[PDB]
Structure 1
Amino acid sequence: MRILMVGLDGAGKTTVLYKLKLGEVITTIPTIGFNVETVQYKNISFTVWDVGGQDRIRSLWRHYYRNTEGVIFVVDSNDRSRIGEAREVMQRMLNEDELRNAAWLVFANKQDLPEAMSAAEITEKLGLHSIRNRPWFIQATCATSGEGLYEGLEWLSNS
């Protein structure tokens, strides 16, 4: 499965990732590009593109326009900024059809790091409330917290 971590990565969106991968943290320059890992479960080995949603990189991902299989949205839960705007973008994913081949997870990260919204509050706000032709249970992490994640995921590959 191709699992997608998008948003601008360098924020620790990438931290979020590095924490998974080695246990470590962003010891890279804030990272625009594909970051790749394979994580093996159900031995679907999830190939993670942790990709900055920075300008080009957001702009240009067409070769990566193919067909999805897993969704992480790694979240600045202090961002409560680009999300409406995001919602406005997000529609075009919705308007993609490759994009409807994943039972997913939005991950609320960066909770400790300032705060976060109602699990619901966000849910409408990115436009998330509105799906169903993909599952849509919700899971919070932080980026110095997160557990039960895997419940979210559990259902998800086993969709």
Structure 2
Amino acid sequence: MRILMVGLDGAGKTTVLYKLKLGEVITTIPTIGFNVETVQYKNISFTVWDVGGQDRIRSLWRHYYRNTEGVIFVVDSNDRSRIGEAREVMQRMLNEDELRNAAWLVFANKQDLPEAMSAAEITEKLGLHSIRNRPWFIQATCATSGEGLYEGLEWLSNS
């Protein structure tokens, strides 16, 4: 499965990732590009593109326009900024059809790091409330917290 971590990565969106991968943290320059890992479960080995949603990189991902299989949205839960705007973008994913081949997870990260919204509050706000032709249970992490994640995921590959 191709699992997607998008948003601008360098924020620790990438931290979020590095934490998974080695246990470590962003010891890279804030990272625009594909970051790749394979994580093996159900031995679907999830190939993670942790990709900055920075300008080009957001702009240009067409070769990566193919067909999805897993969704992480790694979240600045202090961002409560680009999300409406995001919602406005997000529609075009919705308007993609490759994009409807994943039972997913939005991950609320960066909770400790300032705060976060109602699990619901966000849910409408990115436009998330509105799906169903993909599952849509919700899971919070932080980026110095997160557990039960895997419940979210559990259902998800086993969709």
- Which band: TM-score by shorter chain? over 0.9
Deviations 1:32-91 (A, max 9, x none): 000000000000000000000000000000000000000000000000000000000000
TM-score under structure 1 length normalisation: 1.00
Q: Normalising by the residue count of structure 2, what TM-score does the alignment of the two structures yield?
A: 1.00
Aligned partner of residue 80 in structure 1, secondary structure: coil
Deviation at residue 146 of structure 1 after TM alignment: 0.0
C-alpha distance in structure 2 between counterparts of 1:12 and 1:40, whole Å:
23
Q: Provide Cα deviations, 1:74-130, integer angstroms capped at 9, x if missing partner.
A: 000000000000000000000000000000000000000000000000000000000
Following the alignment from structure 2 to structure 1, what is the Cα–Cα distance between the partners of residues 56 and 115?
A: 29
Counterpart secondary structure, 1:27:
coil
Question: After the TM superposition, which parts of structure 1 deviate over 2 Å for at least 4 consecutive aligned residues?
Answer: none
Instruction: Return the alpha-carbon distance in structure 1 between the equivalents of residues 125 and 140 of structure 2.
Output: 15
Root mean square deviation, CA, Å: 0.0
Q: Which residue of 2 aligns with 1:62?
A: 62
Q: In the comparison of the two structures, how many residue pairs are matched? A: 159
Shift of 1:138: 0.0
CA distance in 1, matches of 2:15, 2:42: 25
In 2, Cα distance between equivalents of 1:97 and 1:25: 34
